[PDB]
Each structure stands twice: as structure tokens, then as C-alpha cells.
């Protein structure tokens, strides 16, 4: 909401370090957050009438942004479903939706993940951006165990104006991203 616990932290606790850290000149020039994406393949638009909207009202139930129903671009014999419509669910988070999300994720989510011993440190690489996956979806607060017929993993991709990994690394690190280190 224009401001959050993490947003502040970034501005008055991370902003400083990085500069002092890599020594940036211009204000802008220092790592900021562009957007964090969270999609789901599902691949379950098969027979039995693949509603799987529950996964849409949910994906967004924990995000606050109804997702965008992506479809198959080509068409594959090998694993049924092809040519069009079928599967695909994905929402793009920016600004405040971006912050009020990462918070929970970093504070309440990542925490309870079967074993979770930090976040694999290689998922950066050349990417002034980062990527990571989740098996469950109940790892979040806004949703409980009872209500969720089936499971639902998902990919989370954070984009950064960072050019290097160190730049990206440090940032997500000063923010609160745990790390398999």
C-alpha cells in the first residue's frame, strides 16, 4: 500500500549497503526491483473438464491479482493437449503488489518448505534476475490445507535492474532471501 515493512527496509537498509558495497555513483544506477513473476504450468487442461480456475482464484488469492490464462503456443502429440486454449496460468507483480508479496514469501512462505535449507545460490547466473520453484502452494498464509482439492507448485521469477549476479545476489540477500548459501 504505497509502503510496506520490506519496501522501507529496501530503501533505508539495503540502498545504503549496495552503494557502500560496490560503490555506485548515480542514484538510479543501484539495484532496484522491477517485477516478480509467478506462473504455473498445470498442464492439466486435459479431459474431465479441466476447470482449474480454483488454481487461478488462488494463485491470485495469495497475490491479489487475477492471473492471466496462458495457452499452448504450438501443439504436442507426445503429451496430449495441443494447438491452443488448454493449459497455462500466470500473474505479473509490480510496485506495491510486488512488495506486499515478497514479504510473506520471505517471512512466512519459504520458511515452511518440507526441508528448505536456504535458496539454491546458482539460480542467478548472468541474470540481473533470479528464479526458483515451489512444490506446494499452501506454503502461503492466505490459503489453508483444507481448501485445495489438489496440490500446485509454481515458478517465481524476480527481475532486477541489476546487471551482475553479485549485484543481484547481494540485493535479494540484504532483502531477506534465505540462501542454500
Amino acid at each position: 500500500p504505497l509502503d510496506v515493512a520490506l519496501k522501507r527496509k529496501y530503501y533505508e537498509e539495503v540502498r545504503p549497503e549496495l552503494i557502500r558495497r560496490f560503490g555506485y555513483q548515480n542514484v538510479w544506477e543501484v539495484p532496484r526491483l522491477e517485477k516478480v513473476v509467478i506462473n504455473q504450468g498445470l498442464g492439466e487442461a486435459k479431459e474431465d473438464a479441466r476447470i482449474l480456475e480454483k488454481a487461478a482464484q488462488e494463485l491470485a488469492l495469495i497475490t491479489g491479482q487475477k492471473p492471466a490464462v496462458t495457452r499452448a503456443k504450438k501443439s504436442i502429440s507426445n503429451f496430449k493437449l495441443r494447438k491452443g486454449m488448454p493449459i497455462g496460468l500466470r500473474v505479473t507483480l509490480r510496485r506495491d503488489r510486488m512488495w506486499i508479496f515478497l514479504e510473506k514469501l520471505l517471512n512466512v512462505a519459504l520458511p515452511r518448505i518440507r526441508d528448505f535449507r536456504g535458496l539454491n545460490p546458482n539460480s542467478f547466473d548472468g541474470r540481473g534476475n533470479y528464479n526458483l520453484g515451489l512444490r506446494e502452494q499452501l506454503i502461503f498464509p492466505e490459503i489453508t490445507y483444507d481448501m485445495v482439492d489438489a496440490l500446485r507448485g509454481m515458478d517465481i521469477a524476480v527481475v532486477t535492474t541489476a546487471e551482475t549476479d553479485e549485484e543481484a545476489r547481494a540485493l535479494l540477500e540484504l532483502l531477506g532471501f534465505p540462501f542454500r548459501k
Partner: peptide
């Protein structure tokens, strides 16, 4: 809407989302 994270590991979290009635059975305490 704002919210509250009522874990068990003490530690409450005042932020935003939907339904400020959250029983986070395990915050960042492990």
C-alpha cells in the same frame, strides 16, 4: 487490506493481503 501474522513462535507481522486472521503455524524461527 492490512493483516496480522499470528504464528505460535510469538512474532506477529502487521502487513497487508486478505483476512488479517492468519495463524502462521511457523514464522521465521528455524
Amino acid at each position: 487490506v492490512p493483516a496480522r501474522i499470528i504464528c505460535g513462535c510469538g512474532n506477529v507481522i502487521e502487513t497487508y493481503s486478505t483476512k488479517p486472521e492468519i495463524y502462521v503455524e511457523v514464522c521465521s524461527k528455524c
